Design an enzyme around this catalytic site. Structure first.
Site, mmCIF file in Angstrom:
data_model
loop_
_atom_site.group_PDB
_atom_site.id
_atom_site.type_symbol
_atom_site.label_atom_id
_atom_site.label_comp_id
_atom_site.label_asym_id
_atom_site.label_seq_id
_atom_site.Cartn_x
_atom_site.Cartn_y
_atom_site.Cartn_z
ATOM 1 N N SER A 101 -42.053 43.333 55.073
ATOM 2 C CA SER A 101 -43.424 42.925 55.315
ATOM 3 C C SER A 101 -44.220 42.946 53.999
ATOM 4 O O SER A 101 -43.779 42.332 53.050
ATOM 5 C CB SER A 101 -44.034 43.770 56.410
ATOM 6 O OG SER A 101 -45.075 43.038 56.994
ATOM 7 N N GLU B 107 -40.725 37.313 64.626
ATOM 8 C CA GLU B 107 -41.668 37.832 63.656
ATOM 9 C C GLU B 107 -43.104 37.974 64.201
ATOM 10 O O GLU B 107 -43.791 38.923 63.888
ATOM 11 C CB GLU B 107 -41.689 36.920 62.424
ATOM 12 C CG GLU B 107 -40.437 36.962 61.545
ATOM 13 C CD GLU B 107 -40.292 38.251 60.743
ATOM 14 O OE1 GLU B 107 -41.231 39.073 60.730
ATOM 15 O OE2 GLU B 107 -39.219 38.459 60.144
ATOM 16 N N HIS C 31 -41.276 42.219 64.359
ATOM 17 C CA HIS C 31 -41.531 42.562 62.968
ATOM 18 C C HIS C 31 -41.313 44.042 62.641
ATOM 19 O O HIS C 31 -42.033 44.884 63.125
ATOM 20 C CB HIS C 31 -43.001 42.220 62.693
ATOM 21 C CG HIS C 31 -43.340 42.125 61.248
ATOM 22 N ND1 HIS C 31 -42.740 41.217 60.413
ATOM 23 C CD2 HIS C 31 -44.224 42.815 60.490
ATOM 24 C CE1 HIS C 31 -43.230 41.367 59.194
ATOM 25 N NE2 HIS C 31 -44.130 42.331 59.215
HETATM 26 N N1 LIG Z 1 -61.497 49.069 66.844
HETATM 27 C C1 LIG Z 1 -60.875 48.903 65.620
HETATM 28 C C2 LIG Z 1 -61.291 49.573 64.424
HETATM 29 C C3 LIG Z 1 -60.641 49.379 63.225
HETATM 30 C C4 LIG Z 1 -59.507 48.499 63.029
HETATM 31 C C5 LIG Z 1 -59.040 47.827 64.233
HETATM 32 C C6 LIG Z 1 -59.782 48.051 65.470
HETATM 33 C C7 LIG Z 1 -57.760 47.182 64.240
HETATM 34 C C8 LIG Z 1 -57.288 46.517 65.505
HETATM 35 C C9 LIG Z 1 -56.616 47.238 66.510
HETATM 36 C C10 LIG Z 1 -56.203 46.606 67.690
HETATM 37 C C11 LIG Z 1 -56.444 45.238 67.882
HETATM 38 C C12 LIG Z 1 -57.108 44.489 66.899
HETATM 39 C C13 LIG Z 1 -57.517 45.136 65.734
HETATM 40 N N2 LIG Z 1 -57.010 47.156 63.101
HETATM 41 C C14 LIG Z 1 -55.683 46.449 63.163
HETATM 42 C C15 LIG Z 1 -55.629 44.938 62.847
HETATM 43 C C16 LIG Z 1 -54.248 44.264 63.067
HETATM 44 C C17 LIG Z 1 -53.099 45.172 62.630
HETATM 45 C C18 LIG Z 1 -51.737 44.497 62.574
HETATM 46 C C19 LIG Z 1 -50.701 45.604 62.579
HETATM 47 C C20 LIG Z 1 -49.911 45.899 61.347
HETATM 48 C C21 LIG Z 1 -49.321 45.003 60.486
HETATM 49 N N3 LIG Z 1 -48.618 45.462 59.470
HETATM 50 N N4 LIG Z 1 -48.734 46.742 59.675
HETATM 51 N N5 LIG Z 1 -49.462 47.015 60.739
HETATM 52 C C22 LIG Z 1 -49.738 48.354 61.224
HETATM 53 C C23 LIG Z 1 -48.731 48.756 62.299
HETATM 54 N N6 LIG Z 1 -47.434 49.124 61.712
HETATM 55 C C24 LIG Z 1 -46.317 48.338 61.937
HETATM 56 C C25 LIG Z 1 -45.542 48.007 60.793
HETATM 57 C C26 LIG Z 1 -44.410 47.149 60.961
HETATM 58 N N7 LIG Z 1 -44.018 46.723 62.179
HETATM 59 C C27 LIG Z 1 -44.732 47.042 63.268
HETATM 60 C C28 LIG Z 1 -44.281 46.593 64.560
HETATM 61 C C29 LIG Z 1 -44.885 46.939 65.726
HETATM 62 C C30 LIG Z 1 -46.021 47.777 65.688
HETATM 63 C C31 LIG Z 1 -46.473 48.214 64.489
HETATM 64 C C32 LIG Z 1 -45.885 47.866 63.208
HETATM 65 C C33 LIG Z 1 -43.568 46.875 59.814
HETATM 66 C C34 LIG Z 1 -43.959 47.118 58.529
HETATM 67 C C35 LIG Z 1 -44.786 48.275 58.447
HETATM 68 C C36 LIG Z 1 -45.653 48.585 59.466
HETATM 69 C C37 LIG Z 1 -57.435 47.717 61.864
HETATM 70 C C38 LIG Z 1 -56.985 47.207 60.602
HETATM 71 C C39 LIG Z 1 -57.526 47.444 59.342
HETATM 72 N N8 LIG Z 1 -56.932 46.915 58.214
HETATM 73 C C40 LIG Z 1 -58.673 48.253 59.331
HETATM 74 C C41 LIG Z 1 -59.194 48.732 60.495
HETATM 75 C C42 LIG Z 1 -58.669 48.466 61.820
#
Ligand SMILES: Nc1ccc2c(c1)c(-c1ccccc1)[n+](CCCCCCc1cnnn1CCNc1c3c(nc4ccccc14)CCCC3)c1cc(N)ccc21
Ligand SMILES: Nc1ccc2c(c1)c(-c1ccccc1)[n+](CCCCCCc1cnnn1CCNc1c3c(nc4ccccc14)CCCC3)c1cc(N)ccc21
Ligand SMILES: *[C@@H]1O[C@H](CO[C@@H]2O[C@@H](C)[C@@H](O)[C@@H](O)[C@@H]2O)[C@@H](O)[C@H](O)[C@H]1NC(C)=O
Ligand SMILES: *[C@@H]1O[C@H](CO)[C@@H](O)[C@H](O)[C@H]1NC(C)=O
Ligand SMILES: *[C@@H]1O[C@H](CO)[C@@H](O)[C@H](O)[C@H]1NC(C)=O
Lengths: 531, 536
Positions: free
Chosen positions: B203, B329, B442
């Site tokens: 990623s 993905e 992913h």
């Molecule tokens: N109420 C609030 C307050 C603050 C924030 C909020 C919401 C959200 C949010 C939560 C739910 C729905 C929509 C948005 N996000 C998240 C935005 C989207 C995140 C996408 C997830 C992601 C993408 N890359 N890494 N990650 C973190 C999760 N770690 C994973 C990773 C990987 N794969 C997976 C697969 C499944 C689940 C998790 C996961 C692989 C690589 C490493 C991490 C945040 C993101 C920020 N950058 C800052 C604040 C907050």
């Protein structure tokens, strides 16, 4: 004298001829006038009904072919000459032909009326491929075909004028349709059961009768083969027709509308044909100079508008396409292509070909076409490029217009049956890479393979018998399926949801779904949005 | 010293370290955890490039993972393994610039090839200490020396006022670079070979690796690269200077900052770390998924041009790369921000929910470009079918952000001299807790590459343990030779190089390697060649 060959129609008496078909005799009434010769002051004008005549009119030979450009691309080659005029050219050409069983049928028989294609610039009802004797003899059909004016004579329009109103070739067809209403019963045909069928421009003509109210009372069913009223080539706006007409006038030295047309009328026919091709706005293939015009009269709006809002509840339609609609248009205007080699082309030749195949397309739209039709696994393989060029032209001009029409007719209440024709004639003289080209199903529908002198295989004779049955069952009932048949399988109606059509080839009917569905979303839904 | 395991005392440039004998299934391995490679980037050093760690006196204890870099913690689904396995497993602190080393026990005789892992997490999260990144199995079974580092994420790593002294941008990438320099100078102390260093990441980790490929000062610090489910090119891994400036100054407004750059950063430096994280997400220009607020910036320095320009004109003659993607993905990013989707139901959606989803999944797209996506991804035979729509939504997000970027990268590298091997990973873990519809989401190949299934306590099937052994062998053969194939093994089917001619890649699953051609070739022509031309 032979009573079976004497008929009294409304204009007077006709004598036909007993013709020989493989399985028995048929009656033929050829060269029947349905209109006043549209000559002299009648050039460009709507047709008037033929005046009555004295004595017995001789109706034993095909009459003159409507004046038209004659193809000299490959002189003496069967593949081209079979479409060329087989009688004298003349502006005096409004005649029709009738074939019936011998003896003339006892009860009223369903009538098929054929409308030839030829890009609205050529064609003739007298060609060997349109010979109605087999359908009359084997299926008992009463088959009618008419000549209609083509090119400038049929379609040159100064819209809004009295003296060149446009669409007079379609009115020629409409008058022949009226003639069938009033007279066909004298031959044993049923004016209550009249099926139009046509191919290429003939198909679009059929589609135009569907979309024009005064034609609607003259037939009950329709078959559109490899052509449609909608699409990029079958019509032009009034503005564009005006522009081409006045440009043609300038080119032959002419000169307000009246003055301009009066001078066009003084010109020998061949002068008009000599310059016909020079009025097209771009280098192009599958485009024709003088075609039906959106006049607000015959066509009250664009075909696209009319099929989108029309009510087609009590209509039945058979539509389809051949496997390689675009292949042969390529050997005319596209660099790289020929009937005499395999036409393996380069990537550059393919982008250049797309500008010619889709002449209306901007730089960006042309890129979209190219990107869609490339095989990204073999981006530069010359076979795939050749075949893709062929598919671009076929899809854009025929297959996707047909799919669009089918979908709209079915959605708005019609009963629709759809096919794709995939058998290449054993007798075909075009090269193998063209596959099943535009037009090469007709000889099968008309039953030519039943003539043993034409050297078709046995399977081909049986296949032709199958097709004649589908077409005549459709004419008789609105349904191509043989009611004396469980060993089937059944030809389902085309619907927008399931999108079922059938393959017509030597194997029994196979039912498929989606007529180039993904690729037609490109042409019918996406490309228009690129303006 | 004198009473301790003598096989765990090592010296590095900064001083003496004591590691720990760890137990792996087939034997012991050495671990040196929590080694500092930089001065704590705190106080006036926030937003600044890392300085090398100053030497220390005595023997530094290196037996536990150190602090995780300050970051947003996901709490969507409390208790749920699928999200919590990625959340921080140590204290959050700005004092977080530590790395970890795993080696055989005893430490290898001759110099061993070194793998360096770079975690993902959208450049806003991640940690080198997570269980999925545990280097003990590769160290024990394959004899690898494995190094992972913590690097700053979010504002702390990537907030940039480009052109300024005080917040120049890309400092998280600079943390990574500093750890790479630390491996060059010190890894031979542990028996690793600095002449043979393979970077690998997934990623944002993969995009980071790609950024090291594209940045000259990083190029002398490694020899080979693996990019898993991520790339430096593509819509999410970078921002322009203008856009980074805009986000940085918007974030400053949102935390009360309040007008030249020094003043603004000085005030950001007085803010508590958790204030910055609490507003991090609010600076994105549109509602969107697979977009992150503070990512690498095209600064003219670390990145001399956009990644797209650099891969188009770069000379990659003496470079070997392994790249690939997982089957699904995009699936996971849908439960975050797309109405209609959830982990707790089948997420069968309507056609309207699909067009809405497309605007969110492709936030840069005009009305016309969004219609083009929808038309391309619609099954015109069943255009209202809610299963196909759900899967298409997933494919749009996956293709746009990962698969087609990876295909683009593979094609450019191969065309300009690299040896490229390419994969698609299609095995769904028997232990996975996300729903079936998400497929192979992913990140869920990582636990196989690192060899977790070899731990009997983790409940993986036998075929899975054999498959993990296979993957570890491909990865470490690639690290050792530039070629994932086994040199002796004739019976096992060969992984061929990806070329522009034949576009060959392999399936990684429980069945033996199958060779396929064209990586979503038709659909990737849409995203890589057509869609950009919808700039007008
Ligand atoms: N109420 C609030 C307050 C603050 C924030 C909020 C919401 C959200 C949010 C939560 C739910 C729905 C929509 C948005 N996000 C998240 C935005 C989207 C995140 C996408 C997830 C992601 C993408 N890359 N890494 N990650 C973190 C999760 N770690 C994973 C990773 C990987 N794969 C997976 C697969 C499944 C689940 C998790 C996961 C692989 C690589 C490493 C991490 C945040 C993101 C920020 N950058 C800052 C604040 C907050
Ligand atoms: N230097 C000059 C001067 C004048 C004209 C010239 C060239 C050409 C031309 C010849 C070669 C290359 C480019 C152009 N065309 C022809 C334009 C292309 C016509 C496309 C072919 C076509 C389309 N619809 N009908 N036809 C006529 C051929 N008849 C066929 C037909 C059908 N199927 C087939 C299948 C294979 C071969 C022919 C054929 C089916 C239905 C009816 C006719 C003309 C067309 C005009 N309208 C006027 C003048 C000339
Ligand atoms: C699937 O779930 C979507 C989100 O709803 C969430 O989870 C469900 C089970 C409920 O707990 C609800 O309160 C939560 O907000 C829905 O938008 C969607 O309609 C659901 N899909 C269907 C129709 O099964
Ligand atoms: C086929 O021959 C024509 C006309 O002589 C030419 O223009 C074309 O380049 C040829 N193509 C091939 C495959 O030789
Ligand atoms: C897997 O199986 C073990 C041993 O029986 C069981 O007790 C435990 O609940 C499971 N552990 C995991 C890693 O899910």
């Amino acid at each position: 004298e032979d009573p079976q060959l004497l008929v009294r129609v409304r204009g007077g008496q006709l004598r036909g001829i007993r013709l020989k078909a493989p399985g028995g005799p048929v009656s033929a009434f050829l060269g029947i006038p349905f209109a006043e010769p549209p000559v002299g002051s009648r050039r460009f004008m709507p047709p008037e009904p033929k005046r009555p005549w004295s004595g017995v009119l001789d109706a034993t030979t095909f009459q003159n072919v409507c004046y038209q450009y004659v193809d000299t691309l490959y002189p003496g080659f069967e593949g081209t000459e079979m479409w060329n005029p087989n009688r004298e050219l003349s502006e005096d050409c409004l005649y029709l032909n009738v074939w019936t069983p011998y003896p003339r049928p006892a009860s009223p028989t369903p009538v098929l009326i054929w409308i030839y294609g030829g890009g609205f610039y050529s064609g003739a009802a007298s060609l060997d491929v349109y010979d109605g004797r087999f359908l009359a003899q084997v299926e008992g059909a009463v088959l009618v075909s008419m000549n209609y004016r083509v090119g400038t004579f049929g379609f040159l329009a100064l819209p809004g004028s009295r003296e060149a109103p446009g669409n007079v070739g379609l009115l020629d067809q409409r008058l022949a349709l009226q003639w069938v209403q009033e007279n066909i019963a004298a031959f044993g045909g049923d004016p209550m059961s009249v099926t139009l069928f046509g191919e290429s421009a003939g198909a679009a003509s059929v589609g135009m009768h569907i979309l024009s109210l005064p034609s609607r009372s003259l037939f009950h069913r329709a078959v559109l083969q490899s052509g449609t009223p909608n699409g990029p080539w079958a019509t032009v706006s009034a503005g564009e027709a005006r522009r081409r007409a006045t440009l043609l006038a300038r080119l032959v030295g002419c000169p307000n509308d009246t003055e301009l047309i009066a001078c066009l009328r003084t010109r020998p026919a061949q002068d008009l044909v000599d310059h016909e091709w020079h009025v097209l706005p771009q280098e192009s293939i599958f485009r024709f100079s003088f075609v039906p015009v959106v006049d607000g009269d015959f066509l009250s709006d664009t075909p696209e508008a009319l099929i989108n809002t029309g009510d087609f509840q009590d209509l039945q339609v058979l539509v389809g396409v051949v496997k390689d609609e675009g292949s042969y248009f390529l050997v005319y205007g596209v660099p790289g292509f020929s009937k005499d080699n395999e036409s393996l082309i380069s990537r550059a030749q393919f982008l250049a070909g797309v500008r010619i195949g889709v002449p209306q397309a901007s730089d960006l739209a042309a890129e979209a076409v190219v990107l869609h039709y490339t095989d990204w696994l073999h981006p530069e393989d010359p076979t795939h490029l050749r075949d893709a060029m062929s598919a671009v032209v076929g899809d854009h001009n025929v297959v996707c217009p047909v799919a669009q029409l089918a979908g709209r007719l079915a959605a708005q209440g019609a009963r629709v049956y759809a096919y794709i024709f995939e058998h290449r004639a054993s007798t075909l003289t075009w090269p193998l890479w063209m596959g099943v080209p535009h037009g090469y199903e007709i000889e099968f529908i008309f039953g030519l393979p039943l003539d043993p002198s034409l050297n078709y295989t046995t399977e081909e004779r049986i296949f032709a018998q199958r097709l004649m049955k589908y077409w005549t069952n459709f004419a008789r009932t609105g349904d191509p399926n043989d009611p004396r048949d469980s060993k089937s399988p059944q030809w389902p109606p085309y619907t927008t949801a399931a999108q079922q059509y059938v393959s017509l080839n030597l194997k029994p009917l196979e039912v498929r779904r989606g007529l180039r569905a993904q690729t037609c979303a490109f042409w019918n839904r996406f490309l228009p949005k690129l303006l």
